[PDB]
Short mmCIF file of C-alpha atoms and ligand atoms in Angstrom, two decimals:
data_model
loop_
_atom_site.label_atom_id
_atom_site.label_comp_id
_atom_site.label_asym_id
_atom_site.label_seq_id
_atom_site.Cartn_x
_atom_site.Cartn_y
_atom_site.Cartn_z
CA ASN A 5 28.29 43.01 -18.83
CA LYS A 6 28.53 39.19 -18.71
CA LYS A 7 26.62 36.10 -19.89
CA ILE A 8 23.99 34.85 -17.42
CA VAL A 9 21.64 31.87 -17.36
CA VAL A 10 18.59 31.93 -15.08
CA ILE A 11 17.48 28.37 -14.31
CA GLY A 12 13.80 28.21 -13.42
CA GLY A 13 13.73 31.81 -14.62
CA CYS A 14 10.06 31.59 -15.57
CA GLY A 15 8.93 31.24 -11.96
CA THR A 16 7.58 34.20 -9.98
CA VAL A 17 10.97 34.99 -8.42
CA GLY A 18 13.06 33.54 -11.22
CA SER A 19 11.48 36.02 -13.60
CA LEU A 20 12.23 39.03 -11.40
CA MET A 21 15.81 37.88 -10.76
CA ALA A 22 16.27 37.52 -14.50
CA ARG A 23 14.83 40.92 -15.36
CA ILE A 24 16.84 42.67 -12.61
CA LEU A 25 20.10 41.13 -13.77
CA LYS A 26 19.26 42.05 -17.36
CA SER A 27 18.60 45.66 -16.32
CA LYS A 28 22.24 45.89 -15.21
CA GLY A 29 23.32 45.14 -18.78
CA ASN A 30 23.99 41.44 -19.33
CA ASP A 31 23.70 38.63 -21.91
CA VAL A 32 20.80 37.12 -19.97
CA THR A 33 18.88 34.03 -21.13
CA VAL A 34 16.19 32.15 -19.13
CA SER A 35 16.50 28.32 -19.00
CA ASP A 36 13.52 26.27 -17.75
CA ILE A 37 12.24 22.70 -18.18
CA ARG A 38 8.73 24.24 -18.48
CA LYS A 39 7.86 25.08 -22.13
CA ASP A 40 5.21 27.76 -21.49
CA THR A 41 5.30 31.23 -19.84
CA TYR A 42 2.91 34.22 -19.88
CA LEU A 43 6.16 36.18 -19.41
CA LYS A 44 7.33 35.65 -23.00
CA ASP A 45 5.91 39.07 -23.90
CA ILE A 46 7.77 40.98 -21.20
CA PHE A 47 10.88 38.77 -21.56
CA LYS A 48 11.24 39.51 -25.26
CA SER A 49 10.34 43.12 -24.51
CA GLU A 50 13.35 43.56 -22.20
CA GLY A 51 15.88 41.59 -24.26
CA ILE A 52 15.82 38.30 -22.37
CA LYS A 53 16.14 35.32 -24.72
CA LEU A 54 14.44 32.05 -23.77
CA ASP A 55 15.43 28.40 -23.59
CA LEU A 56 12.30 26.52 -22.55
CA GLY A 57 11.31 22.86 -22.81
CA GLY A 58 14.65 21.80 -21.37
CA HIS A 59 18.04 23.38 -20.69
CA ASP A 60 20.71 23.86 -23.35
CA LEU A 61 23.98 22.44 -22.02
CA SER A 62 26.04 24.59 -24.41
CA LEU A 63 24.29 27.67 -23.01
CA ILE A 64 24.97 26.77 -19.40
CA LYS A 65 28.56 25.68 -20.18
CA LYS A 66 29.58 28.79 -22.14
CA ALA A 67 27.87 31.18 -19.70
CA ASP A 68 29.91 32.93 -17.01
CA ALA A 69 27.22 33.35 -14.35
CA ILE A 70 24.18 31.30 -13.38
CA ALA A 71 21.19 32.38 -11.32
CA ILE A 72 19.00 29.88 -9.51
CA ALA A 73 15.38 30.56 -8.52
CA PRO A 74 14.80 30.16 -4.72
CA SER A 75 12.21 27.42 -5.36
CA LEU A 76 15.03 25.19 -6.72
CA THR A 77 17.94 26.00 -4.36
CA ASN A 78 18.51 22.29 -3.69
CA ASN A 79 17.17 20.31 -6.67
CA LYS A 80 19.40 17.33 -7.63
CA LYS A 81 18.45 17.53 -11.34
CA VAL A 82 19.37 21.25 -11.36
CA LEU A 83 22.59 20.97 -9.35
CA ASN A 84 23.76 18.07 -11.52
CA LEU A 85 23.67 20.74 -14.22
CA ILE A 86 25.07 23.74 -12.33
CA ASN A 87 28.11 21.64 -11.42
CA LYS A 88 28.84 20.95 -15.10
CA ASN A 89 30.14 24.49 -15.06
CA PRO A 90 32.00 24.64 -11.71
CA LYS A 91 34.06 27.76 -12.47
CA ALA A 92 30.93 29.81 -13.22
CA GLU A 93 29.70 32.12 -10.44
CA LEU A 94 26.45 31.45 -8.58
CA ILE A 95 23.68 33.98 -8.09
CA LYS A 96 21.00 33.04 -5.59
CA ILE A 97 18.28 35.48 -4.52
CA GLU A 98 20.30 36.61 -1.48
CA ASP A 99 22.92 38.09 -3.84
CA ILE A 100 20.29 40.02 -5.78
CA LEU A 101 18.90 41.21 -2.46
CA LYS A 102 22.31 42.67 -1.58
CA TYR A 103 21.68 45.08 -4.54
CA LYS A 104 20.99 48.63 -3.32
CA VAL A 105 17.60 50.20 -3.99
CA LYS A 106 18.15 53.94 -4.41
CA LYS A 107 14.81 54.80 -5.99
CA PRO A 108 12.12 56.18 -3.71
CA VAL A 109 9.98 53.13 -2.65
CA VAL A 110 6.34 53.61 -1.67
CA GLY A 111 5.03 50.71 0.45
CA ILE A 112 1.27 50.28 0.80
CA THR A 113 -0.28 48.28 3.68
CA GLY A 114 -3.65 48.08 5.39
CA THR A 115 -6.62 45.81 5.61
CA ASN A 116 -8.66 46.99 2.68
CA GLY A 117 -8.00 49.33 -0.25
CA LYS A 118 -4.38 48.39 -0.92
CA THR A 119 -4.83 47.52 -4.64
CA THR A 120 -6.93 50.54 -5.61
CA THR A 121 -4.68 52.91 -3.65
CA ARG A 122 -1.66 51.37 -5.36
CA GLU A 123 -3.12 51.71 -8.87
CA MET A 124 -4.44 55.25 -8.27
CA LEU A 125 -0.94 56.28 -7.20
CA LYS A 126 0.57 54.44 -10.17
CA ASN A 127 -1.68 56.52 -12.43
CA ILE A 128 -0.77 59.80 -10.70
CA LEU A 129 2.91 58.97 -11.04
CA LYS A 130 2.76 57.72 -14.62
CA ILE A 131 0.97 60.78 -16.00
CA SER A 132 3.59 62.87 -14.17
CA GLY A 133 6.31 61.17 -16.23
CA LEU A 134 7.67 58.75 -13.70
CA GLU A 135 8.74 55.20 -14.45
CA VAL A 136 7.12 52.62 -12.09
CA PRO A 137 8.33 48.99 -12.16
CA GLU A 138 5.69 46.39 -12.91
CA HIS A 139 6.21 42.82 -11.78
CA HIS A 140 3.95 41.54 -14.61
CA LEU A 141 2.94 38.46 -12.54
CA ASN A 142 -0.20 36.33 -12.26
CA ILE A 143 -0.12 36.06 -8.47
CA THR A 147 4.34 36.76 -1.80
CA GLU A 148 7.30 38.15 0.24
CA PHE A 149 10.22 38.47 -2.19
CA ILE A 150 8.03 40.02 -4.92
CA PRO A 151 7.92 43.53 -3.21
CA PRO A 152 11.78 43.83 -2.62
CA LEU A 153 12.62 42.48 -6.08
CA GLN A 154 9.96 44.55 -7.82
CA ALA A 155 11.55 47.62 -6.21
CA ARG A 156 14.94 46.61 -7.62
CA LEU A 157 13.59 46.68 -11.17
CA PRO A 158 14.57 49.79 -13.21
CA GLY A 159 12.49 52.92 -12.66
CA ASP A 160 12.07 56.23 -10.87
CA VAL A 161 9.67 55.38 -8.08
CA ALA A 162 8.58 51.97 -6.77
CA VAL A 163 5.03 51.40 -5.56
CA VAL A 164 4.65 48.05 -3.80
CA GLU A 165 2.13 46.13 -1.74
CA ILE A 166 3.26 44.75 1.59
CA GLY A 167 0.54 42.70 3.24
CA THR A 168 0.33 40.04 5.96
CA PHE A 169 -1.81 36.98 6.69
CA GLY A 170 -1.05 37.90 10.32
CA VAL A 171 2.47 36.40 10.39
CA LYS A 172 4.97 38.37 12.51
CA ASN A 173 7.97 40.15 10.95
CA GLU A 174 6.44 39.54 7.49
CA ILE A 175 5.64 43.19 6.85
CA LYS A 176 8.88 44.28 8.58
CA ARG A 177 11.23 41.89 6.75
CA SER A 178 9.71 42.57 3.33
CA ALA A 179 9.60 46.35 3.97
CA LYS A 180 13.22 46.55 5.09
CA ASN A 181 14.22 44.46 2.09
CA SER A 182 12.30 46.81 -0.20
CA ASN A 183 13.93 49.85 1.35
CA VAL A 184 10.53 51.50 1.82
CA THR A 185 11.01 55.28 2.22
CA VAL A 186 7.31 56.24 2.16
CA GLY A 187 5.00 53.94 4.19
CA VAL A 188 1.26 54.04 3.55
CA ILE A 189 -1.45 52.49 5.72
CA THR A 190 -5.00 52.57 4.32
CA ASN A 191 -7.00 51.26 7.28
CA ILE A 192 -6.99 48.54 9.94
CA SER A 193 -9.85 46.08 10.67
CA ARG A 194 -10.64 42.42 11.29
CA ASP A 195 -9.26 40.10 8.59
CA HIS A 196 -6.64 37.32 8.45
CA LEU A 197 -7.30 36.58 12.16
CA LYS A 198 -7.43 32.78 11.55
CA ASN A 199 -5.65 31.68 14.70
CA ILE A 200 -4.22 35.06 15.75
CA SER A 201 -5.69 37.91 17.79
CA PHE A 202 -6.87 41.19 16.31
CA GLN A 203 -4.20 42.72 18.60
CA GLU A 204 -1.44 40.59 17.10
CA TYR A 205 -2.63 41.59 13.60
CA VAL A 206 -2.43 45.28 14.53
CA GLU A 207 1.08 44.67 15.86
CA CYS A 208 1.98 43.18 12.49
CA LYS A 209 0.66 46.25 10.70
CA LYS A 210 2.61 48.56 13.00
CA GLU A 211 5.84 47.00 11.59
CA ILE A 212 5.77 49.32 8.49
CA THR A 213 6.46 52.17 10.91
CA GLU A 214 9.71 50.50 11.87
CA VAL A 215 11.33 50.99 8.50
CA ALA A 216 9.56 53.76 6.57
CA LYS A 217 11.16 57.17 7.14
CA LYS A 218 7.97 58.94 6.08
CA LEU A 219 4.40 57.80 6.92
CA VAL A 220 1.15 58.38 5.08
CA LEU A 221 -1.51 57.66 7.65
CA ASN A 222 -5.26 57.65 7.77
CA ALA A 223 -6.30 60.11 10.50
CA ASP A 224 -9.87 58.74 10.55
CA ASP A 225 -8.63 55.31 11.65
CA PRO A 226 -7.70 55.61 15.40
CA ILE A 227 -5.32 52.66 15.35
CA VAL A 228 -3.53 53.74 12.16
CA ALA A 229 -3.38 57.32 13.43
CA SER A 230 -1.76 56.24 16.72
CA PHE A 231 1.22 54.94 14.67
CA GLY A 232 2.05 58.57 13.82
CA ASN A 233 5.50 60.05 14.36
CA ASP A 234 7.34 63.23 13.35
CA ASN A 235 7.58 62.41 9.65
CA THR A 236 3.90 61.76 9.15
CA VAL A 237 1.35 63.19 6.75
CA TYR A 238 -2.25 62.49 7.74
CA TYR A 239 -5.23 62.18 5.42
CA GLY A 240 -8.94 62.17 6.15
CA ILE A 241 -12.45 63.49 5.59
CA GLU A 242 -13.57 66.73 7.21
CA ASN A 243 -17.24 66.62 6.19
CA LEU A 244 -19.90 64.94 4.09
CA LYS A 245 -22.57 66.65 2.03
CA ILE A 246 -24.42 63.37 1.65
CA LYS A 247 -26.15 61.39 4.34
CA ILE A 248 -25.02 57.79 4.80
CA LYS A 249 -25.53 54.73 6.99
CA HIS A 250 -22.74 54.52 9.57
CA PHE A 251 -22.19 50.73 9.87
CA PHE A 252 -20.30 51.76 13.03
CA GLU A 253 -17.66 49.48 14.63
CA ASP A 254 -16.21 50.13 18.11
CA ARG A 255 -12.54 51.04 18.66
CA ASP A 256 -10.58 51.16 21.93
CA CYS A 257 -8.11 53.87 22.73
CA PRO A 258 -4.65 52.59 21.80
CA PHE A 259 -3.04 54.61 24.62
CA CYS A 260 -5.30 54.12 27.65
CA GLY A 261 -7.60 51.30 26.49
CA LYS A 262 -10.90 53.04 27.19
CA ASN A 263 -13.57 52.75 24.53
CA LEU A 264 -13.12 55.60 22.02
CA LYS A 265 -15.82 58.30 21.74
CA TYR A 266 -16.96 59.47 18.29
CA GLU A 267 -18.34 62.90 17.36
CA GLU A 268 -18.92 61.92 13.70
CA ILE A 269 -18.76 58.66 11.72
CA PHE A 270 -17.88 58.21 8.04
CA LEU A 271 -17.63 54.48 7.45
CA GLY A 272 -17.47 51.71 10.08
CA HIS A 273 -14.76 52.67 12.57
CA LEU A 274 -13.49 55.56 10.40
CA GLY A 275 -14.66 58.89 11.80
CA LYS A 276 -13.76 61.83 14.09
CA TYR A 277 -12.88 60.39 17.51
CA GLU A 278 -11.40 61.37 20.85
CA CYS A 279 -10.45 60.05 24.29
CA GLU A 280 -10.52 61.62 27.74
CA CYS A 281 -6.87 60.66 28.29
CA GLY A 282 -6.02 63.27 25.72
CA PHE A 283 -5.65 61.25 22.52
CA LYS A 284 -7.41 62.93 19.59
CA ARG A 285 -7.72 62.41 15.84
CA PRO A 286 -5.03 64.45 14.10
CA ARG A 287 -6.20 67.23 11.79
CA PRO A 288 -5.29 65.84 8.37
CA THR A 289 -3.34 68.02 5.90
CA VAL A 290 -4.58 66.02 2.89
CA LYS A 291 -8.34 66.30 3.25
CA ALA A 292 -11.64 65.56 1.46
CA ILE A 293 -14.16 68.40 1.71
CA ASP A 294 -17.88 68.33 0.82
CA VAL A 295 -17.83 64.60 0.07
CA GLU A 296 -20.66 63.39 -2.15
CA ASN A 297 -21.09 60.00 -3.88
CA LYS A 298 -18.90 60.55 -6.94
CA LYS A 299 -17.38 64.00 -6.30
CA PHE A 300 -15.44 65.82 -3.51
CA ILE A 301 -13.00 68.72 -3.06
CA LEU A 302 -9.47 67.47 -2.33
CA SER A 303 -7.56 70.07 -0.28
CA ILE A 304 -3.84 70.08 0.35
CA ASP A 305 -2.44 73.24 1.90
CA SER A 306 -3.41 76.15 -0.38
CA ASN A 307 -4.70 73.89 -3.17
CA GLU A 308 -8.20 72.69 -3.84
CA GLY A 309 -9.30 70.47 -6.69
CA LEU A 310 -12.56 68.72 -7.45
CA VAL A 311 -12.11 64.93 -7.64
CA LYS A 312 -14.72 63.14 -9.79
CA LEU A 313 -14.32 59.38 -9.23
CA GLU A 314 -15.77 56.72 -11.57
CA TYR A 315 -16.52 54.22 -8.85
CA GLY A 316 -17.66 56.28 -5.89
CA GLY A 317 -18.27 55.73 -2.23
CA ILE A 318 -16.65 56.90 0.99
CA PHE A 319 -14.11 54.04 0.89
CA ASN A 320 -13.00 55.09 -2.60
CA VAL A 321 -12.64 58.66 -1.27
CA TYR A 322 -10.29 57.18 1.37
CA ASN A 323 -8.30 55.25 -1.28
CA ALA A 324 -7.97 58.46 -3.31
CA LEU A 325 -6.89 60.40 -0.18
CA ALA A 326 -4.16 57.86 0.57
CA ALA A 327 -2.90 57.96 -3.07
CA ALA A 328 -3.04 61.75 -2.95
CA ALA A 329 -1.12 61.91 0.32
CA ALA A 330 1.57 59.57 -1.03
CA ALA A 331 1.97 61.72 -4.17
CA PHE A 332 2.13 64.89 -2.06
CA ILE A 333 4.96 63.34 -0.03
CA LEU A 334 6.59 62.74 -3.42
CA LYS A 335 6.20 66.45 -4.41
CA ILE A 336 3.90 65.68 -7.35
CA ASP A 337 2.19 68.77 -8.81
CA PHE A 338 -1.35 69.22 -7.42
CA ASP A 339 -3.06 69.41 -10.81
CA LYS A 340 -1.28 66.13 -11.70
CA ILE A 341 -2.59 64.51 -8.46
CA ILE A 342 -6.06 65.61 -9.49
CA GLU A 343 -5.63 64.37 -13.10
CA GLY A 344 -4.35 61.04 -11.82
CA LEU A 345 -7.39 60.65 -9.61
CA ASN A 346 -9.98 61.79 -12.17
CA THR A 347 -8.64 59.60 -15.03
CA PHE A 348 -8.12 56.48 -12.95
CA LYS A 349 -9.72 53.33 -14.40
CA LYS A 350 -11.14 51.09 -11.63
CA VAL A 351 -9.89 47.50 -11.40
CA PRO A 352 -12.30 44.78 -12.47
CA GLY A 353 -14.27 43.13 -9.68
CA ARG A 354 -14.74 46.42 -7.97
CA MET A 355 -18.49 47.15 -8.09
CA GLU A 356 -18.64 45.80 -11.60
CA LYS A 357 -21.98 45.88 -13.43
CA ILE A 358 -22.37 42.70 -15.53
CA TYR A 359 -26.14 42.87 -16.33
CA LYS A 360 -28.70 45.71 -16.69
CA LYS A 361 -32.17 44.35 -15.91
CA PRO A 362 -32.05 43.09 -13.32
CA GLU A 363 -28.93 45.01 -12.22
CA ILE A 364 -26.14 42.51 -11.46
CA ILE A 365 -22.99 43.71 -9.64
CA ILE A 366 -19.91 41.64 -8.82
CA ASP A 367 -17.54 42.75 -6.10
CA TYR A 368 -14.35 41.47 -4.46
CA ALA A 369 -15.68 42.29 -0.92
CA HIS A 370 -14.43 39.56 1.42
CA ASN A 371 -14.54 40.92 4.97
CA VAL A 372 -16.76 42.96 7.29
CA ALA A 373 -15.19 46.26 6.23
CA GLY A 374 -15.58 45.41 2.49
CA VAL A 375 -19.24 44.37 2.77
CA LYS A 376 -19.96 47.48 4.88
CA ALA A 377 -18.27 49.76 2.33
CA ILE A 378 -20.19 48.45 -0.69
CA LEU A 379 -23.52 48.24 1.20
CA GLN A 380 -23.04 51.89 2.23
CA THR A 381 -22.27 52.88 -1.38
CA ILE A 382 -24.71 50.69 -3.35
CA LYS A 383 -28.17 52.24 -3.78
CA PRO A 384 -30.58 49.80 -5.46
CA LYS A 385 -33.75 51.44 -6.74
CA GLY A 386 -35.51 48.09 -6.49
CA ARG A 387 -34.89 45.24 -4.06
CA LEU A 388 -31.57 43.86 -2.95
CA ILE A 389 -30.67 40.26 -3.49
CA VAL A 390 -27.22 39.32 -2.25
CA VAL A 391 -25.41 36.19 -3.44
CA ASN A 392 -22.65 35.56 -0.90
CA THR A 393 -19.68 33.49 -2.16
CA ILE A 394 -17.56 34.61 0.82
CA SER A 395 -15.78 32.11 3.03
CA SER A 396 -13.90 34.51 5.37
CA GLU A 397 -10.31 33.45 5.90
CA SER A 398 -10.58 34.46 9.55
CA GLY A 399 -13.25 31.76 9.95
CA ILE A 400 -16.87 31.29 11.10
CA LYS A 401 -16.78 34.21 13.58
CA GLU A 402 -16.40 36.88 10.84
CA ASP A 403 -18.67 34.92 8.46
CA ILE A 404 -21.45 35.26 11.08
CA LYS A 405 -20.62 38.98 11.45
CA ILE A 406 -20.91 39.38 7.64
CA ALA A 407 -24.26 37.48 7.57
CA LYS A 408 -25.65 39.73 10.32
CA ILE A 409 -24.52 42.76 8.27
CA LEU A 410 -26.19 41.22 5.20
CA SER A 411 -29.51 41.12 7.01
CA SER A 412 -30.31 44.50 5.29
CA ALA A 413 -30.56 42.55 2.02
CA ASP A 414 -34.12 41.61 1.07
CA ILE A 415 -32.80 38.17 0.18
CA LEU A 416 -29.57 36.39 1.06
CA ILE A 417 -28.40 33.45 -1.05
CA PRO A 418 -25.36 31.72 0.38
CA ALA A 419 -22.97 30.50 -2.32
CA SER A 420 -20.40 28.77 -0.16
CA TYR A 421 -20.41 26.19 2.62
CA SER A 422 -19.19 28.78 5.15
CA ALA A 423 -21.72 31.38 4.03
CA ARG A 424 -24.57 28.87 4.35
CA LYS A 425 -23.44 27.85 7.83
CA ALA A 426 -23.28 31.53 8.87
CA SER A 427 -26.65 32.57 7.33
CA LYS A 428 -28.56 30.70 10.05
CA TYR A 429 -27.63 33.56 12.41
CA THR A 430 -29.08 36.36 10.22
CA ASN A 431 -32.51 38.06 10.38
CA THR A 432 -33.44 38.26 6.68
CA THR A 433 -35.09 35.92 4.17
CA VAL A 434 -32.49 33.21 3.33
CA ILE A 435 -32.84 31.07 0.20
CA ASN A 436 -30.35 28.24 -0.21
CA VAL A 437 -29.20 25.91 -3.00
CA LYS A 438 -28.28 22.21 -2.84
CA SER A 439 -24.54 22.69 -3.62
CA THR A 440 -24.00 24.35 -0.24
CA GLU A 441 -25.94 21.67 1.63
CA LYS A 442 -23.29 19.08 2.44
CA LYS A 443 -19.52 19.45 2.58
CA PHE A 444 -18.07 16.02 1.98
CA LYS A 445 -14.46 16.98 2.84
CA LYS A 446 -12.97 18.44 6.05
CA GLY A 447 -11.82 22.02 6.53
CA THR A 448 -12.79 25.12 4.57
CA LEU A 449 -13.87 24.61 0.97
CA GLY A 450 -14.25 27.88 -0.95
CA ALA A 451 -17.11 28.72 -3.32
CA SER A 452 -17.10 26.61 -6.48
CA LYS A 453 -18.16 27.51 -10.03
CA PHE A 454 -21.25 25.28 -9.57
CA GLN A 455 -22.21 26.80 -6.20
CA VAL A 456 -21.91 30.35 -7.56
CA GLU A 457 -23.83 29.15 -10.64
CA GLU A 458 -26.75 27.73 -8.57
CA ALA A 459 -26.87 30.82 -6.34
CA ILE A 460 -26.89 33.24 -9.31
CA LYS A 461 -29.68 31.23 -10.99
CA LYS A 462 -31.73 31.27 -7.78
CA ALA A 463 -31.17 35.04 -7.61
CA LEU A 464 -32.38 35.60 -11.21
CA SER A 465 -35.34 33.36 -10.34
CA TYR A 466 -36.35 35.75 -7.55
CA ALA A 467 -35.34 39.13 -9.10
CA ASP A 468 -37.65 41.57 -10.88
CA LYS A 469 -36.24 43.62 -13.75
CA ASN A 470 -35.90 46.61 -11.40
CA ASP A 471 -34.03 44.69 -8.70
CA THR A 472 -30.32 44.59 -7.91
CA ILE A 473 -28.45 41.31 -7.49
CA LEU A 474 -25.16 41.88 -5.66
CA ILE A 475 -22.54 39.06 -5.97
CA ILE A 476 -19.82 39.39 -3.32
CA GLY A 477 -16.57 37.46 -2.91
CA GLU A 478 -13.61 35.91 -4.71
CA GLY A 479 -15.64 33.12 -6.33
CA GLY A 480 -18.30 35.58 -7.43
CA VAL A 481 -15.84 37.87 -9.20
CA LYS A 482 -14.05 34.83 -10.67
CA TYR A 483 -17.07 33.01 -12.14
CA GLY A 484 -19.88 35.61 -12.37
CA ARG A 485 -19.19 36.99 -15.79
CA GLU A 486 -18.91 33.58 -17.47
CA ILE A 487 -21.96 32.22 -15.62
CA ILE A 488 -24.05 35.19 -16.79
CA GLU A 489 -22.64 34.96 -20.33
CA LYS A 490 -23.25 31.22 -20.73
CA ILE A 491 -26.76 32.00 -19.48
CA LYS A 492 -26.79 35.24 -21.58
ZN1 LIG U 1 -7.26 57.09 25.63
#
């Protein structure tokens, strides 16, 4: 119970440091040269007074302890101020990291589905009366460990990697992850690195998490399994779908894996002659249909009715379910959490009726495959691709080839245009994707997405579907359509 200043306490980490210290009972006040923060609402909500547009010397001087945001650990202007109060005690992020997390921490990792799994679980937990710490940020590595140190009952955090080694591991150990979840593994973030190296990065979660929630339908994820592992998966479909199959090699002997049934891409029921076989999942999805399936866990069975449907959403729901089960959450509550879950925007979002216009965050082969498998246009399919795969041209090409099923493909980014020359469908381009004046990757712009959408509307009938995929598309689609009305 002391007086603490948090210089640069409006930054991503500064904010969390501030809140954490405040949650231990302290006369906390944030000091920042910046005069604007979206965090004023949550700051005032938790009893953290502000001192923006410059630092109050009296504040700093009187205060007993001062916290410094990592991004300003060695800033002359800031240290010339911290040393105006030499007898005060310093609190850098390492000190806050020393703080013990005792709350159960659920860590979610994987290629796709992390966000939806995370929010589904957050819903399940919340309606069950459990406090989950929110970082309340508009954006790293220190976010997950610090978020988990915020007050609450159970922490649910995202631990991803661009493919950088020990990222997952360091952040997971620092978050004290007790329950480790892996949604799926596929090609993404492979800019310079190998797919193999990426998989090795993902395996890191299994080096810290005591318990593991693994996808049994993903051979690579499944092979990570230990003694404290709960597996989830699909046992059967009642609907017929397009496989979009992707090969997988046996992780133990290297031979190409044989599949007896396929659900989505590389997710299915597999086996190897060496003896490796898909584990029978205890958290399963029975009689899967588009927007309805029976979730079965031990002796319990409950009908899940999802708003946004699709096999990949079934998988997200299974992972969330499995995590909750590990947490001993009542079955009916797991069901309620799933059935009342509100899907995140940008996830198969309808933003126009005739023609149908959907926007979706899909940004890799697995994402495009998932939505293409789920989407069922009654009319034609016009795709507007704003994707500029972070892996590079190789996956862009793969995505374009996948997109060949589209009646029309309209590239909305430089990368997407470049890649579309290797696809076997009708390709209609726009001038904004014609010449890149600068070097290196240049993501889809508002104007490029604008031109592409207009071209799409120009070709679409009232009964057609225009699917807008990618970051740029989700980001500018609504306003482009609204300014066009
Ligand atoms: Zn094998």
